[PDB]
Structure formats: structure tokens, C-alpha cells
From a paper:
All six mATG8s are essential for autophagy, are conjugated to autophagosomes and serve to recruit two broad classes of molecules: autophagy receptors and autophagy adaptors. On the other hand, autophagy adaptor proteins interact with mATG8 proteins on the convex autophagosomal membrane surface and can regulate autophagosome formation (ULK1/2 16), autophagosome transport (FYCO1 17), crosstalk with the endocytic network (TBC1D5 18) and autophagosome fusion with the lysosome (PLEKHM1 19), but are themselves not degraded by autophagy. Structural studies have shown that the side chains of the aromatic residue (Θ) within the core LIR motif are placed deep inside of a hydrophobic pocket (HP1) on the Atg8/LC3/GABARAP surface, formed between α‐helix 2 and β‐strand 2, while side chains of the hydrophobic LIR residues (Γ) occupies a second hydrophobic pocket (HP2) between β‐strand 2 and α‐helix 3 (reviewed in 3, 23, 24). To provide a molecular basis for the specificity of the PLEKHM1‐LIR interaction with the mATG8 proteins, we solved the crystal structures of PLEKHM1‐LIR in complex with the LC3A, LC3C, GABARAP and GABARAP‐L1 proteins.
To obtain the complex structures, we created chimeric proteins consisting of the mATG8 C‐terminally fused to the LIR sequence with a Gly/Ser linker. Crystals diffracted to 2.50 Å for PLEKHM1629–638‐LC3A2–121, 2.00 Å for PLEKHM1629–638‐GABARAP2–117 and 2.90 Å for PLEKHM1629–638‐GABARAP‐L12–117. W635 interacts with E17 in GABARAP and GABARAP‐L1 with distances of 3.5 Å and 4.3 Å. Additionally, in the GABARAP subfamily structures, this hydrogen bond is stabilized by coordinated cation–π interaction of R28 guanidinium moiety and corresponding Y25 aromatic side chain. Similarly, GABARAPs’ L55 side chain are closer to the PLEKHM1 V638 (4.6 and 4.8 Å for GABARAP and GABARAP‐L1, respectively); LC3A/LC3B/LC3C V58/V58/L64 are distanced to PLEKHM1 V638 at 5.5/5.4/4.3 Å. This is likely due the increased flexibility of the GABARAPs D45 residues, which are not visible in the electron density maps. Superimposition of LC3C and GABARAP‐L1 α2 helix (having biggest difference in orientation) in other projection (obtained from structures above after rotation in 90° around x‐axis).
Residue numbers in the entry: 0 to 121
């Protein structure tokens, strides 16, 4: 109302595409797909992990953060031994939480959820 404004670290999608442009496609999606969530997934700067082929994702609102984590690992083509960690607003999100709950708490003003991944906790 009285609702917190979420500011995150520097994402590349947040360098390529002015806020007025990022915003626009944001409200366009949530009206076209109310049951799903727009998520931007990028590699952390110093992280030693393979870069993601595609970084724009439409995720079901009732899918857990943990399930999306295993989904990304399969896309990064990590093996069963590799370490990977999500950072949403520079904090590691709970696995039990749903992507809908995570979006509602950590979406920026452009109606985009930003998830960063690394092999360490920075």
C-alpha cells in the first residue's frame, strides 16, 4: 500500500533495455498470462558456471523454487555433483516457496523476477 519496492543488483537485461522498455513487456505478460510468472535468469559476474542459452522464462505460479532450480540445472547441463545457488535480490530463496510467492515478494518495478545463479554464495 505501503508496499516495499524491490531493488536488485546489476543484471545484464537491466543494462540492455531501458526501464521504460523493460516495464512495458512486463505488464503486457501478466495480462496475457495471469497464471504464470516472467523470470529473468542470469549468471553471476564472477561465477564459474556455463552461461544460459536463453534467459527469459515464463514460469507457472504454482511451481516451487526448488523445482525451477533443478529445471535450470538441466539447462546448464550440470552433472549430479556440481554446485549451484540461486540469488533473488542478493538472498538465497527458500526451496519450499512457490514462484508465485517469490514473485510477489521480490519482483522489481518492471514486473520482472530476477534470479541470479553461481557456484558459490556471493
Amino acid at each position: 500500500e505501503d508496499e516495499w519496492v524491490n531493488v536488485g543488483s546489476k543484471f545484464q537485461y537491466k543494462e540492455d533495455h531501458p526501464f521504460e522498455y523493460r516495464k512495458k513487456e512486463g505488464e503486457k505478460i501478466r495480462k496475457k498470462y495471469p497464471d504464470r510468472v516472467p523470470v529473468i535468469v542470469e549468471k553471476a559476474p564472477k561465477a564459474r558456471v556455463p552461461d544460459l542459452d536463453k534467459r527469459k522464462y515464463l514460469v507457472p505460479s504454482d511451481l516451487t523454487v526448488g523445482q525451477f532450480y533443478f529445471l535450470i540445472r538441466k539447462r546448464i547441463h550440470l552433472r549430479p555433483e556440481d554446485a549451484l545457488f540461486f540469488f533473488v535480490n542478493n538472498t538465497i530463496p527458500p526451496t519450499s516457496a512457490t514462484m508465485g510467492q517469490l514473485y510477489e515478494d521480490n519482483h522489481e518495478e518492471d514486473y520482472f523476477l530476477y534470479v541470479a545463479y553461481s557456484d558459490e554464495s556471493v
